[PDB]
Structure 1
Amino acid sequence: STGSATTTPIDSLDDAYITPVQIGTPAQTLNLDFDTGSSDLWVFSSETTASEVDGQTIYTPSKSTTAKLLSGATWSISYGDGSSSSGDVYTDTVSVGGLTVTGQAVESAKKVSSSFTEDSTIDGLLGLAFSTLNTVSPTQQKTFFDNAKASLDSPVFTADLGYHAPGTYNFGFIDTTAYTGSITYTAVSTKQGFWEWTSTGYAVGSGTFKSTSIDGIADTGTTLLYLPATVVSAYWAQVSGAKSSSSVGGYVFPCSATLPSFTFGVGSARIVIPGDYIDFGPISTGSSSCFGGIQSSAGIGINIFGDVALKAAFVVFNGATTPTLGFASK
């Protein structure tokens, strides 16, 4: 089997991407944030504290003839950005772009943190990291991909995120028309439960490539590109007036700037992030100070190849017995 679904930016900045997901019988369609940095499929629901729901579409398990309460199971997750959610668990039928899993754990939120409430466009998350990170207790549950894998034509999914435009998540096949040149594959460590890999280096604009190993995670659920402070400083030094602002929370730059591109290495291959991908707009409405899309990972504890990086590529998440990642230009 295969599946193919369009993923759409939630706003004009590509702050996140939503993909429609069918849950239950009859189908209840929710728009979920596909997150290769986590491993829980959780949804706003009829059980979510009412004051914490503000415009989201909810899953109502009592209206699904295929929903079954997973007795005794609870979940609770905290994300790198400080947000969190928790609740109980159903199993139900879940379909993405024509690919169906029966008995998928659907984690129903009883509580969500303010940032989730405040984002009306995201109805929940669909985790695509390794199932070892799944938070369901006392019996850990499998991700949608993990459940689908054996049925797929090939045990892979691909992320093709757009810049200011829709893109595609495919399951079970590689669309050879969706990228240019070749896909370069690179080793993955699953030891921390992430799609963790090592970039071979970087360049800023038309500058020379610096060969240096950068370990980090391919994370579709993180907006920006978080890299070591040395790398980030080298980038922003090429933008007149750019500075790191403790009050804002990272590098800012004059909105009148033309940003240079940023290149990262995948083996001997190179992915070029155009300068415009690195512009996240005014820090506050009407400001002429703009927020940068490349930020320091110092104090995160890990480098994160988030959407800023991934949207410059066609990305293969290869869930073979020994997982690997593939990157192509597009």
Structure 2
Amino acid sequence: IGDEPLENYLDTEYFGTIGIGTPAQDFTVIFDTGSSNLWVPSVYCSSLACSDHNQFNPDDSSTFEATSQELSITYGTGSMTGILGYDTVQVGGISDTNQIFGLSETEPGSFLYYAPFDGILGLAYPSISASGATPVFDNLWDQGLVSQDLFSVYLSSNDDSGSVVLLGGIDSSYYTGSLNWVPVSVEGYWQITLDSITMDGETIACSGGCQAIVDTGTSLLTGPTSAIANIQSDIGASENSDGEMVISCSSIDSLPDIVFTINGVQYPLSPSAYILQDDDSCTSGFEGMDVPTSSGELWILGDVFIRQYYTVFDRANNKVGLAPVA
């Protein structure tokens, strides 16, 4: 069982350190359950974002193996192109030998330039991995480096330390009650069916159900634009002249919970969860973002949600487990 500590950066980004190569070259990466590739910047990249982050240098590792397979990934925000290579990846105390990963060659645009972290470590299914690159957790399982085919995630609140990804285990001290298991509706993302979103026992979005993903790599709780506007209206949020969904810090205390029903079970978020506070600057924890799929538009249950619920991602089962944080 491997234990990867995560830094909680401003309750907005959670990343941990990994080593790549021999000897290990270190990188910070988002542990991202909404994607499946591992990549880091490399010395082959001249983009601005590569210039202000740690760069992998294959010529300094005795265990690197080149490939000629190319890689291209577009995220919600940010994108990269690169080349795949193999090396040993030290993650959560495990030596992940023979791990295929991306060496960036372009990282265009500005979001990544300002980001504290170097790269991304995807924890989703191989079906959404670009160039069909074996994801890290799949490689760990395939090599028998974890005995149970599952991992769990605790994300801390209030910028505290203690966030972790537990590779190959579940630690019950992080949660109250027993885990509620939710079947994966579509295997690619960790995608599940949301049954309803309610406030004061009135349904306010996702009438008749809707698809959602559990995504540690997304800060906010996102959903279709029109539905989110309604929610924002419902919690009394309004965009300021600077493009920021502002809310009076007094509402944290007046407002009711917003309840997510998942596999027939209620998962409330109190105002203190769905409203972000920073010394009398309070923004909405909801953000409108349209994510079209075959099935339907996706909701994203990001860090706003995950901070409240210890999450188990079970590949043996194809289930997500949830329970309220301790």
Same structural fold, with TM-score higher than 0.5 when normalized by the shorter chain: yes
Seen in structure 2, the aligned counterparts of structure 1 residues 129 and 299 have a Cα distance that, compared at 3 Å, is: closer
Figure out how many residues of one structure are paired with residues of the other and give that number: 312
How big is the shift at 1:258? 2.3
Residue 39 of structure 1 is matched in structure 2 by: 36
Structure 1: how far apart are the matches of 2:184 and 2:32? 17
Residue 3 of structure 2 is matched in structure 1 by: 4
Match status 1:188 vs 2:184? yes
Gaps of 5+ in 2: none
Secondary structure of the residue aligned to 1:177 is helix
Q: Which residue, out of 103, 108, 111, partners 2:103?
A: 108
Structure 2: how far apart are the matches of 1:47 and 1:189? 39
Structure 2: how far apart are the matches of 1:315 and 1:126? 17
Residue 202 of structure 1 is matched in structure 2 by: 197
How big is the shift at 1:190? 3.1
How big is the shift at 1:114? 2.5
Secondary structure of the residue aligned to 1:80 is coil
Seen in structure 2, the aligned counterparts of structure 1 residues 56 and 323 have a Cα distance that, compared at 3 Å, is: same
AA of the residue aligned to 2:20: I
Seen in structure 2, the aligned counterparts of structure 1 residues 230 and 53 have a Cα distance that, compared at 3 Å, is: closer
Structure 2: how far apart are the matches of 1:296 and 1:110? 31
Q: Which residue, out of 215, 220, 223, partners 1:219?
A: 215
Residue 160 of structure 2 is matched in structure 1 by: 165
TM-score with structure 1 setting the length: 0.85
Q: Which residue, out of 58, 62, 65, partners 2:62?
A: 65
Structure 2: how far apart are the matches of 1:249 and 1:78? 24
Residue 142 of structure 1 is matched in structure 2 by: 134
Q: How does 1:245-256 map to 2 (within 5 A)?
A: 251-255=245-249
Residues 292-327 of structure 1 show CA distances to partners (whole Å, capped at 9, x for unaligned) of: 11123446632111111111110011001x411111
Residue pair 2:313, 2:320 contacting (<8 A) in 1 also = yes
Structure 2: how far apart are the matches of 1:231 and 1:165? 32
Residues 171-224 of structure 1 show CA distances to partners (whole Å, capped at 9, x for unaligned) of: 111112121101000110335x211101233333xx226485231111111111
AA of the residue aligned to 2:59: S
Residue pair 2:222, 2:301 contacting (<8 A) in 1 also = yes
Q: Which residue, out of 242, 262, 265, partners 2:261?
A: 265
Residue pair 2:36, 2:122 contacting (<8 A) in 1 also = yes
Residues 217-248 of structure 1 show CA distances to partners (whole Å, capped at 9, x for unaligned) of: 111111111135575355434544x2256x75
TM-score with structure 2 setting the length: 0.86
Secondary structure of the residue aligned to 1:25 is coil
How big is the shift at 1:270? 2.8
Q: CA RMSD in A?
A: 2.6
AA of the residue aligned to 1:134: S
Residues 124-180 of structure 1 show CA distances to partners (whole Å, capped at 9, x for unaligned) of: 0001111121112xxx22100111124222100111111122311011111121211
How big is the shift at 1:17? 0.8
Secondary structure of the residue aligned to 2:139 is helix
Structure 1: how far apart are the matches of 2:27 and 2:261? 36
Secondary structure of the residue aligned to 2:273 is helix
Seen in structure 2, the aligned counterparts of structure 1 residues 209 and 172 have a Cα distance that, compared at 3 Å, is: farther
Secondary structure of the residue aligned to 2:105 is strand
**Higher normalized helix content (fraction of residues):** 2
Structure 2: how far apart are the matches of 1:6 and 1:232? 33
Seen in structure 2, the aligned counterparts of structure 1 residues 299 and 87 have a Cα distance that, compared at 3 Å, is: closer
Match status 1:94 vs 2:93? no
Gaps of 5+ in 1: none
Residue 49 of structure 2 is matched in structure 1 by: 52
Moved over 6 A (4+): none
Structure 2: how far apart are the matches of 1:6 and 1:31? 11
193-202 vs 309-318, which deviates more? 193-202
Residue pair 2:126, 2:135 contacting (<8 A) in 1 also = yes
Residue pair 1:54, 1:120 contacting (<8 A) in 2 also = no
Residue pair 2:48, 2:113 contacting (<8 A) in 1 also = no
Match status 1:307 vs 2:306? no
How big is the shift at 1:25? 1.0
Structure 2: how far apart are the matches of 1:50 and 1:237? 40
34-43 vs 249-258, which deviates more? 249-258
Seen in structure 2, the aligned counterparts of structure 1 residues 57 and 120 have a Cα distance that, compared at 3 Å, is: farther
Seen in structure 2, the aligned counterparts of structure 1 residues 212 and 161 have a Cα distance that, compared at 3 Å, is: farther
Secondary structure of the residue aligned to 2:252 is coil
Structure 2: how far apart are the matches of 1:298 and 1:116? 19
